[PDB]
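Continuing from the previous page...

OK, I double-checked the sequence for Photoactive yellow protein against my notes and this is the correct one:
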Amino acid sequence: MEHVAFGSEDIENTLAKMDDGQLDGLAFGAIQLDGDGNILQYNAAEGDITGRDPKQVIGKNFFKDVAPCTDSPEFYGKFKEGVASGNLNTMFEYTFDYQMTPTKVKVHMKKALSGDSYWVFVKRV
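Thanks. Re-ran it with the corrected sequence; updated structure tokens here:
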């Protein structure tokens, strides 16, 4: 297993070195989005939590296609405020309930070290 703790202060530096295969060794869900919300990376732990097949969601828009329950001021609204500002670091609890059993999770959104990319980390609560 890859040893990185959910919510670590330097998580973006640690994950910058990770290929899709190493991202799959994380103890929590990790999704990398571009500024428009398109999925660039989606790890195995995230698929375990949500039921989505990782390879199938890459390239889809997270807010429009995959996760409509997140299209709200409380999730997507925070993401879009962060992209526009060029800075994002927020953690909050949320319930995923689209085409799945309602599941309570802790979400951490953070701007990646890379230019136009943002991370969404997820763990069960």
